[model samples]
Target: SMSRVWLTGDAVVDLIPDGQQHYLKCPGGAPANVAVAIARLSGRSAFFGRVGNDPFGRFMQQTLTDEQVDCQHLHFDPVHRTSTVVVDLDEHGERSFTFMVKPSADQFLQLSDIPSFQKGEWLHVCSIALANQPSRSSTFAAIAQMKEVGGYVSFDPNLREEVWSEPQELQATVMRAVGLADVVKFSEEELQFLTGTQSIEEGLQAIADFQIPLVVVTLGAKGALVATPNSQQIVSGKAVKPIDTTGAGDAFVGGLLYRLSVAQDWHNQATILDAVKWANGCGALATTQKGAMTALPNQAALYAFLE
Candidate 1:
């Protein structure tokens, strides 16, 4: 078993305001960030998606390649443009996005674009790919293919409401993916929004029927809540004055999936708890830097921080 983790979804370029009248181009998109995060931690990761056949797309390809992520299935689409997002920071340093390209190449993913899946491998997905048509169908098909081969599935509802043309469909669409995943990670807000509940306990109860093997709810500085069908626990994270919160969630997911991918028994309670601890550390550390991928910890860095 190679324990390779496959990430599918958009790979975009985020332009962040650096100074007066200037923006910094940074590699972004949740799944892509997670792939790089896994690679940085010395875990096997592969990326499969569509980026435009343009400079930004080439840059994304080069970025993933340079990080040692497998890009064999990453395609370059000639028709649609690569996704480019503007990262706007408010006076309080909170970040917001203004997507520059609609219906980007990533949304045009075809069923033919999917690669082969194998047992012991993992597939990670975010909600953006499910916001549109061909990509949505292709993503679901990929999930089925992975499941049919006994591969694990990870889902993160990295919801960007603006991306959905029919916003009402979001809950059902995202819930469908959530039901199929073995492991699912959600932010407090996302859980509440999707489950239509205000309290964490209520939200967790709402999805208990899904009988998902593992469910994690990230609670910013406080850490994460790890819930199984029968039990739930909170894992505390290290305290750090975050410089920029970008990609921290993706880093957490990357760390968690990397640990699970290598574990002999991912269902073991101890294994799941330990993985959450590593994930918390990864998430906290990522915010110590400015850009999304800039502070993603390497194995040495992560170990040092944990120690």
Candidate 2:
């Protein structure tokens, strides 16, 4: 049976400019986007996070549920508001964000909010949830619990410097999670910044002691570099003119995890390489449309694109 992927983090509403002086409300947040991407690929995904009890939160809950993601552990907090981000796009479709809410409801995630994990199941997380107090501790606890249960853990340090109150603490805190993760994914820039290295080779060398089973570094237009304890290689992806690049990385993670979950031997070199191919395809395709989840591909779409 395929492993069930459990994702815990923020479920945000991103307001994107529509080019008409108006904004489009899009369901977003890294983990949330990954969950939707997995579900859209017919992979099982469950989300556990806190959102405001307001309309936006309700909409997020409904959106995930409608996408067939298990939201039994999703909570609606009465006090804090849902996360709202303003996504600023450049002519190249690259994105920058302005967070509208600090310490949003997702920042209030508790250890109690996490669900029990079974052996062979997967838990995937992003750095955003580790930016605050209760959520930070709780996310760590959740990762520890998943490890204790013999489940696989995936981490993506989707860095947003403005989200951290103490930017100096970001590296150590994120590295802690990276050390605990079975699979870790980084963008070329994230790898450099976190490791205080200017080159990808230097960055990978810095974290070599962690011995993370799988490490992937995403390269926007080219593809992704896949590294294991003893070997490293680049997996090329199909190219496309991106309309919005917001959730491409999350989609890559989603596709990678989906492939891992379904594989009998996820650690096998062949399996990992194939997974990276799927990931590259998913990431590239995601940028072909606007919004985080808008262009996430289904199995058929992915297959069609790959062939």
Candidate 3:
């Protein structure tokens, strides 16, 4: 049986406009995409948290279940509103997001929202959950709980400067999460911003602390860099033509987590690097689809792509 990974935070519906021809509705939210991507790759990934008991929430709830992700911890909250994001695409097919919900249901998550699991389970959280209250503290509590039970925690500080109330708190609070997480992932820009460095070399120095097992700084198209306490390696990615660039990072993370879940000796650095190959492959393939959840490569597809 596959090991379970619990994904936390926002589950939103993105309204993507294709020219003036009207908008397309796609189920999104980074953590949600990660959950489905893990399942698509033949691993066990689940979602935990409350979404508004509305149309968007219902859609998110059902979409994840259909993708074979465990959605039992996904609760319905009548008091909070579901999340919606508007997608704008440039001529080069690069995408940008604008959230419509200020205090979305995911951000209001409390300490009680954490999912229950035994030791060695994986719990993943994104920085968006840390941008606000209750959810911020709740996420920290969840991380603490996971560590308390000897579970591993992964954090991706996918920063959204506009999402938080105070910009100063974003750095102070989110940086603190590094201490709690066993693994951390960051995009290229996130690395530069977090470390205040113009280059990846300097960026790596900033996170050298904590001596946590794994750290990855993802480079779109160029692949990702892996860092441990004593060493670092840049993993090259497979080249591909992308149709839609949405959810690439989420898919990459799903691939990595899935690989680690199946590893007999996961802590070995070589094993982790092998996971990055899957991470790069799946993330590159996911962009061929227009949405976040769809087009995640299955075991057969991943094999086919590699051959």
The estimated TM-scores of all candidates read: 0.97, 0.97, 0.96
Candidate 2 lDDT over 12-118, as tens digits, reads 99998898799999999988999999999999999998999989999999999999899999999999999999988656645678889887999899888988889
What overall lDDT goes with each candidate model? 0.92, 0.92, 0.86
Write one digit per residue (lDDT tens) for candidate 3, span 1-307. 7567989999989887866988889998989999998988878888898799888999998898898888888888788889888888656656688888888888888777677876878999999999888888888898888889888898989888777877789887888997778889988888788778888888777777678799988877788888988888999888887877778888888899989988766788889998999999889888887887778899999988877
lDDT of 1 at 256: 97
lDDT value for model 3: 0.86
Q: Return the clash pairs for model 3, or none.
A: none
Better of 2 and 3 by lDDT: 2
Clashes of each: 0, 0, 0
Give lDDT tens digits, candidate 1, residues 90-150: 6664678888888899999999899999988999999999999999999999999999999
Error of 1 at 195 (Å): 1.1
Model 1: CA > 4 A from native: 91-93
Which residue pairs in model 2 clash with each other? Answer: none
